[model samples]
Target: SADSATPHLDAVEQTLRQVSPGLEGDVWERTSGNKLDGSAADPSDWLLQTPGCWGDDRCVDRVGTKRLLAKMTENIGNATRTVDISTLAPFPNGAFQDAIVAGLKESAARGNKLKVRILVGAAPVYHMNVIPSKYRDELTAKLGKAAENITLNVASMTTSKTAFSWNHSKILVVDGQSALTGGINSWKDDYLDTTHPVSDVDLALTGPAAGSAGRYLDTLWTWTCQNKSNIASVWFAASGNAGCMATMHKDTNPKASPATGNVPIIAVGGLGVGIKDVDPKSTFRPHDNTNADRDYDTVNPEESALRALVASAKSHIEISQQDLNATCPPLPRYDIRLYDALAAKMAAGVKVRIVVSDPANKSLSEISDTLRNRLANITGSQQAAKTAMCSNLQLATFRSSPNDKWADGHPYAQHHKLVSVDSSTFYIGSKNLYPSWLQDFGYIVESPEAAKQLDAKLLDPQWKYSQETATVDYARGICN
Candidate 1:
């Protein structure tokens, strides 16, 4: 049984409603949650607990974090501030950082008194061009009192390996009043495309979502003393003169450096409810096919909650994923659960697209063999998919065509975990189209306007490469 099937399916479905109440009552079932959930409606209330990113060199998902910061730091000449960043790209890079800094320096010269804080992972922004080592200290001293208003905090998460999560969330809290949380971060190097460029989608919220996400941050803050807000503030004062909570300014120096656009957002996670878990291992790995598993026959109310969103799609489903191993049971792949639902939708006439890294890329021998085996299993079932069981499904692989080195030093897998359905709604979070995640880390989204916007703005020629040819071979291989 999936981890979420036994105990938490209902609660997970209920909380998902908090994000997307407008979705039909029976949209998110255990299978849907495990594989794919829709976009978010209440983006601000949405907390991105996993890792993801968006945007290109030209556009820094500015509608969310980048633009917000530019506006916040526009004119604080005497205040010091720090920004703690450890995430890898789709966020702005040196150019992006320079733009904000230049904007602030100009503001400081105008007699606003601003100090700034910048914290980056030990890893530099670009592999080809590392930020000068001296620059870290040099920037601190150069900003001086100006730093007080602006703070930049760059640190590392201990669990981060070369290929794992450094920080998968994109969070921006302005003066504690509002915070934006969702997938996507601030490494411009992540988006170094000069030709066809990709964009990202994020949501902003100031209410409970921000508070909860902030609390999540406190968990990480506990891990590193340097991450403590107090230490950050002390550094700001040491080099500049910005006060974090004590002294307040009338309003942010530059009230809003808004972006020219936005993306569709949604809230569609079924937090505590869905398929209940039978055993820890069962949730992690199931041992039945859709036909043999008696458990797969049960009705999952949460499935409908998520299905309501999927059914409404008019154009396409762009699924950006970290991984996909979609055969697990109780909620077997038999009756067309997550992967099948998507295929079913596609069969009903919706364009489907997927971007997944070569699972074997940078893997150990055993890991590679395991990945290939799992994929072979998925394909093995593809032949049976058309018999009212799995028809609308199509799959594709994301391989960096030679020069696609967006992620500098880290492994450049397509870590973006999200789905944009028919350009109207999209989903973002830690979930992959697999049973384990749905039973555990899976989350959905509920931003219709944001979804519409992202489909239009981000799904340009660059992010989505072409050829019905590329996907056909893979799909055919599976069906056979």
Candidate 2:
């Protein structure tokens, strides 16, 4: 059995080797100050959600994900022109899907030339076999003859030939002007308090940044239709057919700059997959524009940028992610790359605090494996007994309620990937800490005001819910 499993293990190792960064060269842009457009950082421009507090009339003005969803649904119901949505997951909520689908139908009936584009992530066995396929079929069949105006595409940006590659971007751009993105997904369980709920965050942009987000979605849509191969494009399709790029983008220009935001928002995309003997077709850059000067590397930009942000920390660093793991080993510091930066920061007396999901939930085995391997590499300790003693590594996990259920009878998760440094910088998006070789997106904002607001709202409440621990105790408890 062990020998039979050798190929899978070998493939995983090969992927790690390909995705890992090299020795000394920095992979980040080293500009000094704010890399944003001159637009004022409007307080209303940033939208956040507090899970329990959402839905009250007071929550409407606060700009929560629920509020955004309601507004988007309303717009879809009322819009005469178009609705474009690019999400990692499908519309799982039956009611939500019904309403949106109805709106699309109405738009089509109104003869507004309504163009509805739903670009979903399609990874062969994992992503494509289930919801996305069903969603597409249901939409097309439900539309009857009205499906002519709607264009739906599935994109997988993985370069790996052997394994599953996920396109984990969550974005919704309406009529090419407004957009919503962050960590929120469409599953009703994600929104319901009774089902398995996930307390997530998303941002809504109305200015030029929103247009760029739309442009980014279009770029992926175009890329997904054109690139076809066995290794990468197993399930990718534009309307259940291969080679849809020619059909979809006949009028859309691939080279034009789609972003017009006065405020600086980098549409940084990330790719995670096994070693690529050849480059993959799907590539994401900084500004989502061919004209913009961007150094798009194979490395996930969000992860690389997060490491750089941690390295730039002076006083302290606070990280909240679902899974925290080291990249790959025996580097200049004898530890994983991200951990190396954090460890160095801790060694230099930079306060570090990490909040992850309770190991008992989804990531128990992952955390244990990470600690075991990371401890081995860091200390060369064959004696697993004495490994309990380590310092300056502060970790915590949120408390979960097994019996707690929403009105619809669902539980939830603390699905957030947020980080802030010295109360001046903040990073938030769908990118998790575990290196899954998934294509994702995130934002790195250099604003003290924004950071403070995030701390006051998102980070503080999370820390309040979590309890501290040492790696040894955490791993031992999980293993036992």
Candidate 3:
């Protein structure tokens, strides 16, 4: 019934291990692969994080931003040549951000030709005054000439209330060798605030996949360069820099920086976000836009992969996200395609497990209605929908409040944009289920070991533990 639930999970998973012998350059545009270089990481290593509660309690994650920050800072400081980063709205002055700046300073102090490029969305970061001055200005003030080694650019969002815009992809590529990307925005409130810090997840890389991730960031940088209005204080670096050029530096040379492990991984991201604005060219539309930057018709690799991953599941799928709405306020309330994928999985009798931030009665009603209708459409009737959907779906939430904090005293959230499929592969990134105008990034890691750890460490405690510390799960209406 469930598409012959065999190791077909492994069958599709191996497609990501390598690009295949002769068909090497085939996946260039679709899977973050460059024509010059393929996307697969034959010997790649992966590290997944959930901010607090280390699985085995060897004191790894029994904390706040401590563990995650150290990993990021160490990679950034140790970069021998280049460091590439992108995030939604990095708090200009926060622990997460300060660490980034400090590492840039460290790399610059290395005295080598270090090229650092940082990208942030211009709307909230610029409009909200979150980052009053450019990184070039801030770092230049601190490190002097060494600051010149770094260049920061803000991607313009749409000026129109209806246009799609905003950069949601959080990525970190170090020395073209190591990389990190996921939901952890460099905000004090999200990572270090004692008040409302949110729980987030990130995947660190030490292999060729990190370099593939670098290629995806290349698109974000080139996309940023295309928005000229946001380029006032931005630096294009020297004359013939590779990133912003029309050809777009295809970090096609993977042999130069090889991966460290044998894990197969593919870096996927919402590439080439629609940059249209009210004036046809303008600043970023703030995250508060009514209907902006949320288009489901647009199918970039990252979004396409989101759907494909859900459809390919044979047994069970676990999802964690902030919310289910795409742009919330306007018309396209839910991601139709994403829901359709879930419906298909349910129809085939695959289990769907989900966790999110606090859910309200209104949101619950909407999802219940959507799921019922979607299953009805897929299975032919409301009665059958009840049978096919409710029997297979379980939903939960990890409610975070002002008082919640880790042992180290930082708040957390159910903010992880993560998904695990059939215990075979897992996706971790800043991408939401409704990954639209949000420029997001993530990797499809084909590793059962990693997925197993995700279950025992990051997910189970919250989903199964007592509400005195964990949370609660309510049934979808169809089940009732």
Candidate 4:
């Protein structure tokens, strides 16, 4: 069906052609819409952006945090009509926080009917800890004053007792022209201050993709305003408009930026199926389930879409994440369905490479042993599993960058949630590979240019330039 969500029944990178911006449906439909409770929406509508990845990740350290932050701040400051943002939180006190505040203030200072809408993830404990300040308060305080012509609206994810189920989309669209999205949070601490900073990646885009992002933000804004009682939303500088009072839902007829790149792209995202809507005791019967309570993310479009991409891989698959354990609340377990796909691919001779932080219990040793043992359970013999894995699978720990304060100790983290298939298509966004409830977004991009760029900027440096450990040694219960 033309209206169906993608990783469509038949979607292959080689067969794809770089067409116009609005034709994503010709290949596969992307995840789109606004569901207040975090469910996947209609995919018939989507965005078009220059699909590439960049960040503070050690692999992309050359691109650097300074450049990334400067670009984002500049985009926000230059907005003419609107600025739409959806991030985990406003920011913690630091240079990152100051830069963001300065940008917002700059846009507002410009003065003429500049509309700004910010949607952030909030915690219920904010209401519980009556004495403590809230996430929005910090930003709002920094933005002490604004031009009367500048309208600012702020909204939050409803209080649902789920930590991971927050607005985890790191997206910003300025004036419906330029856009940026990835795993880098707005408030991530920096290494310059002698602190361990988080490592992640992001992308820059122009054209219809930016408009599409603006439209999607409007969808979320519209949905949030609709359920005013369940969600908290507010506007400063001006009162409500007749249509609903968040910012105007202008994606329907957004200003389009010229198509600047040839990257074939599809914007995909994830939303939590709020425990408030379903009986938490009910079942999604996810990949690895112990107690009935461990069943989370069965129908989550993000996971479903990612699983589909993994299953579709032909030559090889490479992923970099913070953890292997896709732990949702109630237990620290992992989802093996995606791993099953990896094992299946390895058996079929597809090389699989993975990089993750060597955090305590989820260290490099446990990762190898757990994966090898899980595959053994599937193939009916440990030897067959070892034969396939020891040859086809390569897993390594993230190399600590010089920016890490605890360079040799437990540092900040490698926070990129990325999946690259066959080195031709890549996925990057806020969706952590691990399980848990989170409002997430990522894009499936097919671009040889992006492929080479990512390699030069991220993978090659991290994989080849740094310490290389063989997983086979880990399989033998020793560090390589």
Candidate 5:
């Protein structure tokens, strides 16, 4: 059971400088071994990170995971709690919190000899208002024991006022054998579904690498626990979230929430995701909407990631998600609307296959298990066009229950957020198909070579584990 959480927990906030000043460039360039192909040899038999879902639809954000590992030590045995780290109390979409809570409850239930202690950093104000005000109480109630675990070392990052980003990392260390840390929350909104969309890779390691990761979490643990004065910069850095508000307010006649399409877009295979010139004269105002400023998101309403995903031909879309089509108050446009676009492509002789985790029981139930619910919602007069177009699509839902022996399985959900297109180009990271990620700070990476690597490493074993799917047969989808 401990092996499941070992790989990721091994590192919380890894400081790359320690590994080698060049580690960043090397890892970024895919020169380092951990590039999703799963070919990197075991760090002396160390386990790989186990993908986790904190809350509903919550999947591990890979960039955040990198950040976590960057803060660790090369040797894990020397690691210990130094930071008074805590989590943002759970909310509807708080996927990272969900993972922690699930693991914690399991620990409590088993009455494991290991004494578990926790500290919950107060949720900062910037993140406080993102969800409906009414949701706060429910969220607080959801993550019941955060208060009980608080070490109360009041020094935290903050803004001049009380508004700043709260702690966004999820990390865990277990008796030094392993650790788990990353941007994964307890919510499913950000996990990998490993089915129709794509799934994230959660690595669990057991050797020196695990120890190396544990050291990273220790650093954060120290800062959060002993330091009570680290809030100033976090508070000041928040000016970006503020400056955009003014521009958004003055530009719109309808008074929409101030939007500055100036968010950075990190091209997966490029030098980086988005380009922003920090020089005052540069057009890169925090949320600048002008064409002069950098282009906003690359999503072309009907094209880009959303369209590319649903429109795949002769390719199976494997998605590993924590939650889907379950956003509250409902979305005016369901993700399935892309189905119309997909069906058209399918009918034109492109075979379409999908695997969706049922939100009803998290990823434990596949869409094919309760095919009726999926069908009923898509068969209306309004959805007819889309429905008719999807007749040839093959879909399945995976129900991989966390083994009772494993501590992270109690809540019973999937937290992988990735999509393997035609088993060739694989996109992994934090962005989801919803409109939410387009506006939030997130990242995505496209690995054309990753699939080829997986064919030699990850796919065969995973298919065997799921016992249903096998062999990546649609390389053409990716090549196209």
Candidate 6:
């Protein structure tokens, strides 16, 4: 029954190409960082995460979601191409709800040439659905008459307990000039003005790289559109809707340029392993096995970039993740060969330090234990070899502090997923270190200045908790 689901995947691709033509070589700009001022460690700006510091008064590189939304709202006035977005969670209410809804309606009302294309995840839990059926109703009510110009598609997933899949990527493409991706979901709180907003990261693209990122979204959108029943039955027929497509024309200096430093940045997505294929006619399947387990070994862009960066570590390696794991037993251990890679780096005299979330929200203590044991296996079975390796590796978590002056007197989840290698290159994205088939997107920035800035923010003494207050297992633990 499911095998015969959608048989018109080719049509979807054709439809996508009709609207948006592909562009090349767009540069990127770092819109947001841990600090609003983009400085290396000011006490005032260090602890405070400024989500509202974009578009207006912030520096050129400090474009947060708040400012991004404002830009989308304002830029729609004269937009000739399109506004395309592929988001995980797009709530109807948030600080920027009015602006986004109004912007889309106004842009559509201006002319039919200015299109709005939104592809959101339609994964349902029980009777509670994420992509609300009322989404169209609300937009139509707000737009009154201009609703005909927008194309909203819902990418549905097959229900399964053992394995489930949804669009975990967040992207915003405007007029083929900019693309935003990192971990910022399209929720009001994702912007700013919340006591304990989910700590996250986002990158805004301006050059050809921006167009490249947009193409990725376009492909995913086309794939998602293959499930026409999941979309057309609710919104409108894909035949009638004019979704935003890539442009064939290229603009001057279309290639990506680094926002802050001179390092080149590339956008990579984790499209394999546990995620569904972008083919609408394809059935959902799980490929949780490692490269060794698969008959055809293909390199995963996200995993490869991570390994290349870690293996290149000449001095030190720093990682901050929500969940880090080598493997979850009973399945397969080779899933995350990163453990072996990192351990080998340590043996080569490279120092490795990691910061993870504490028990205040979710704890990876189990993975911590598994990681420690895995390190011994990789370095050597001997106790002395383990001790030598441990000396160079440090692992800690972020502790919850209601009494702390920062974090709005609430428990904070160290929700940033980042990796900085040798003070040269950094990887920031939605993927955690968990060995699974989860699809996420990230950016690989090869810049010494950017790496140093990230190091200062993550390695700061204020964010890291003490061993006594937070869970920490260092070299001494294994040495003794």
Predicted candidate 5 versus true structure: per-residue lDDT over 1-480, tens digit per residue: 346211111121121122222212211111111222122343211212234222222333343233223223221212222221223344324444354344434443443322222333234444443332244334335535542331112122321222222333333444434433323443233333332112334332222222233333333333333333344322211111212111111121121112222111111211111121112222222121211122222211111334444444344444444443334232222344444444455445454444444343432232222222334444544345334324444443433322211133323333444455455444333334432211111122233444444433444333333323311223222210
List residue ranges in candidate 5 displaced over 4 A.
Answer: 1-183, 186-303, 309-314, 330-333, 361-392, 401-411, 435-449, 452-480
Which candidate leads the pack in TM-score? 3
Q: Give me the displacement of residue 72 in model 2, in angstroms.
A: 3.4
How do the candidates rank by TM-score, highest first?
A: 3, 4, 6, 2, 1, 5
Tell me how candidate 1 scores on lDDT: 0.36
TM-score of each: 0.48, 0.66, 0.75, 0.74, 0.39, 0.70
For each candidate in turn, give its C-alpha RMSD to the true structure in angstroms.
12.1, 11.3, 7.7, 8.5, 16.0, 10.7
Better of 2 and 3 by TM-score: 3
What number of clashing residue pairs does each candidate have, in the order they appear?
Answer: 128, 13, 15, 4, 114, 23
Superposition-based RMSD of candidate 3 using all C-alpha atoms, in angstroms: 7.7
Task: Give residue 193's lDDT in candidate 5 (0 to 100).
Answer: 35
Q: Cα lDDT for residue 305, model 5?
A: 38
The positional error of residue 230 in candidate 2, measured at the CA in angstroms, is 5.7
Best by lDDT: 3
lDDT of 6: 0.49
Quantify how close model 4 is to the true structure by its C-alpha RMSD in Å: 8.5
Candidates ranked by lDDT, best first? 3, 4, 2, 6, 1, 5
- Candidates' C-alpha lDDT: 0.36, 0.50, 0.57, 0.56, 0.31, 0.49
Cα deviation of 48, candidate 5, in Å? 5.3
Where does the lowest 10-residue lDDT sum fall in candidate 3? 19-28
Candidate 6 C-alpha lDDT tens digits along 1-480: 347211222222232222111211121122211111223433222112224222212122333445555554664544556666665544345644576677777676777544555555433342244444455566556766666665544333321234334456666666656555666665543424555444466555344445556555654544444444443222222213443232322321233333432335555554433233233322213245444432111213455446656776778887876557434443353335677677777767787777665446524456445555667777666564566455676666644232332245454455566777767666666666655444456666665655565655444432333233334345346322
